[PDB]
Every structure is written in C-alpha cells, then in structure tokens.
Symmetry: C3
Subunit: 116 residues, 3 copies
Amino acid sequence: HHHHHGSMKLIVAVVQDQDSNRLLKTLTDHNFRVTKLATTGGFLKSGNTTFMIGVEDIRVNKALSLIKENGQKRDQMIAPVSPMGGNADSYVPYPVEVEVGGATVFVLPVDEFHQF
Amino acid sequence: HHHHHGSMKLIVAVVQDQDSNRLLKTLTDHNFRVTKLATTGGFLKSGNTTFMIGVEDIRVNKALSLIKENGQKRDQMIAPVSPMGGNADSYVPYPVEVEVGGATVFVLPVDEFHQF
Amino acid sequence: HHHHHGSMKLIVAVVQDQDSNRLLKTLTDHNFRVTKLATTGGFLKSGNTTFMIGVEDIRVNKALSLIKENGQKRDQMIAPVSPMGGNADSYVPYPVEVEVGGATVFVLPVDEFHQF
Ligand SMILES: Nc1ncnc2c1ncn2[C@@H]1O[C@@H]2COP(=O)(O)O[C@H]3[C@@H](O)[C@H](n4cnc5c(N)ncnc54)O[C@@H]3COP(=O)(O)O[C@H]2[C@H]1O
Ligand SMILES: Nc1ncnc2c1ncn2[C@@H]1O[C@@H]2COP(=O)(O)O[C@H]3[C@@H](O)[C@H](n4cnc5c(N)ncnc54)O[C@@H]3COP(=O)(O)O[C@H]2[C@H]1O
Ligand SMILES: Nc1ncnc2c1ncn2[C@@H]1O[C@@H]2COP(=O)(O)O[C@H]3[C@@H](O)[C@H](n4cnc5c(N)ncnc54)O[C@@H]3COP(=O)(O)O[C@H]2[C@H]1O
Ligand code: NI
C-alpha cells in the first residue's frame, strides 16, 4: 500500500542557552514561527533550550542555515558527586570535559497541520 | 523500497494558557491521554502550553475537533525593550499587536508505540 | 510518488519522576544521547518527565529495552476539587486511583538529522 506526508516539517533543535536569544531573534526576524521548550541536557544535567519550528518544506533549508550559522561550540564539565559539594569545588583533577555543539537538529515529517 | 508507519499518531498542539485547563478537561473527559509541556511563544516571549496527545489514527479526527472547538483568538502585544521598563509602561504609541489563534497543531506519524 | 525517511529515529518516552534519574544514568552510561523535558501528566495534573532520545535505527531496540526494564508501575490518585483543601485531605472515601505505567513511548521517523 501507499502513503504520503504533508508539506510541513517540524524542526526540533536543541541549542545552548548562551545562543538561544540570538537564534530566536534571527528566526522570528526571518518570519519563522517558534515555540521554545526549557529542557535539560541528559549528560551535563544542566539547562538548555529546545526550539520547535514548524516550517513549510520549501523553507526548511533556510531555517536550517540560520540555525547552523547561529551557534558556537563550548566546553562544559560534568558536575562531580555532590554530597560534599563544599570540596567538589575544590576538586576534580581530571575534569570530565565535553564539547557542546551549536545545535542538534531533527527534521520530522508531519501528516497534518492545522491552525484553529 | 517500501515503508509504513504505525497506527498511532502524535498530536502536538500549541494553545494559549487561558484555554489550557478547558482543553485538558475536555480531552481527558473524552478518554484522550495527554502530556502537557510548559512552553514559551517565540514571538511574544510569553508562556503558553503545548499538549502532546498520542492517539490511535481512528480517533485523531475527534481529538482535532475538540481542540478546534476549544480555543479563542486573543490579541497580545510584543513587550518593548525593557532596560528602562518604568516608562515602557508609559510608552508604546503604536503597540505591535498580534492575534494569537486557538491552536497550532501538528499531527505526526509514529513508527512504534510502546506501553512498558 | 515515492518517499523515504532517514536512518535516525526520535524516541519520546514519558516516565515517572521516581524512575527518571535511574533511566537517565542507564541511558547515558550506554552512550545514548538524551534531552529531558519537565512535563505534567494530563490526568493526574502532576509532574512527570519526558525523555527525547535521538537514536540511530540500529540502536533503537537497545534503547527501548533499557527503557522497558527501568520503570515500575505505581498507584496514584486524582486530586479532589481544591477550593476547601484543608478537608479534601480529610476526604475522598472512594479515591479515584490510577495505575501509572513504567513508560509510554513513541518512536518517530526523522527526515533529516543535523549536528551543527
Ligand atoms: N552519553 C554520552 N556519553 C558521552 N558524551 C555525551 C553523552 N551524551 C552527551 N554527551 C556529550 O555531552 C555534551 C552535552 O550533552 P547533554 O546531554 O548535556 O546535552 C545534549 C542533549 O540535550 C542534546 N542532544 C544531542 N544529541 C541528542 C540526541 N541524539 N538525542 C537527544 N538529545 C540530543 O543536545 C545537547 C548537546 O549535545 P552535543 O552532542 O552537542 O554535546 C554533548 C556531547 O558532547
Ligand atoms: N509554525 C509554528 N511552529 C512552532 N510554533 C508555532 C508555529 N505557529 C505557531 N506556533 C506557536 O503557537 C503560538 C501562537 O501562534 P499564532 O500563529 O496563533 O500567533 C502568532 C502570530 O499571530 C504572531 N507571530 C509569531 N511569529 C511571528 C513572526 N515571526 N512574525 C510575525 N508574527 C509572528 O504572533 C502570535 C504569537 O506567536 P508566538 O510565537 O508568541 O506563539 C506561537 C508559537 O508558540
Ligand atoms: N497516549 C498518550 N499520549 C500522551 N501522553 C500519554 C499517553 N499515554 C500516557 N501518557 C503520559 O504518560 C503518563 C502515564 O500514563 P499511563 O497510561 O501509564 O497512566 C495513566 C492512566 O493509568 C490514567 N489516565 C490517563 N488519562 C486518562 C484518562 N483520560 N481517563 C482515564 N485514565 C487516564 O492515569 C495515569 C496517569 O496519566 P497522566 O495523564 O497523569 O500521565 C500520563 C501522560 O503524561
Ligand atoms: Ni513515510
């Protein structure tokens, strides 16, 4: 049998808080419609921002190019086991550092789009 | 080659806070299952509510009709540049007004649905 | 006409807060990448946790098996009408109890995946 999807895509982009306001302004200035979700990174257990951007298929590439050009790689660290916290500040000799990328982006197919 | 999707759909509906409790009650009263996300509108930079509703394909239209009948258009304004806020109250001669719709809704295909 | 989707899937898993930290540790220990959303159950009107896990199709089953083995069924109750709250504590003779499952999981197709 046979199926298709609609003309809209749903972009889900996880970005760093430090890059969020910058991205949001660029997107809405370019007439993109955005919903923002306050999220937490699973590895760093720290706040980040997820943007949900429903876009016509013909504008997906422009949205992606704005997201790509917006962000910056940053180094962050995993928070040590915190029962003693007043010394964990003092510690970590070999910080578990990770590089956080500008954006992790999913472009999802959409069966139906409605504005009610 | 050939693929299909499952019988479930994932409805993602962005609604106004003022209409949220009303919608939620209607949905769960009609045996729909709902997860609520506290979100922010990208343009107004204000709180709104996103409902995630996983629905059998055969009940999608009923869910959509409840969402459609629930909401109301409302006017809102963009908050002016706030460094001086004590006068921004005083200002805005030509308020940038927008009309917020009852619901923006995405119906997503789902490859697998599991209840563990 | 003809379409396909990409090799990535987006897993959306709604779990209980009591099982969240346990699941997160297991997932990231197994090299899965996770974004966490603080959500609310529509029926219980209480906090729960939604994990968004973008996974290569070839690792989906492993992710699902970790999610499945992680959770536990728990009983919860619907909060009574609260205008008098100081007696609603006193009340509810026939508590509306529900069984909350370990995880409700959607595996979504993904058209494009980008790391910028
Ligand atoms: N299990 C693991 N083992 C070793 N290293 C790990 C790891 N999980 C994450 N990392 C590393 O830690 C950085 C921050 O991850 P976090 O989970 O806090 O924050 C993530 C998460 O919120 C989200 N993310 C990335 N990939 C994802 C995916 N496939 N599915 C869901 N969320 C993803 O984007 C944020 C930034 O990710 P990015 O890859 O740029 O950067 C990641 C990566 O460098
Ligand atoms: N395609 C999409 N993808 C993701 N989320 C979507 C979306 N379309 C709508 N939304 C979400 O629904 C809320 C209401 O959108 P609506 O289009 O009814 O009402 C909008 C519309 O009248 C206007 N608007 C939004 N973005 C605009 C823009 N970039 N330029 C001009 N007007 C915009 O401002 C109102 C409030 O927008 P806000 O962003 O605060 O809040 C939006 C946003 O959270
Ligand atoms: N199809 C779906 N789409 C979106 N989210 C879904 C979903 N199925 C489950 N969920 C999410 O998973 C949580 C646990 O659902 P579960 O079905 O295990 O456990 C449920 C179920 O036993 C019952 N329940 C939920 N909605 C009901 C309803 N409308 N009528 C009767 N019972 C309901 O109450 C328990 C807690 O529900 P709550 O809404 O607080 O919390 C739900 C909701 O956040
Ligand atoms: Ni398809």
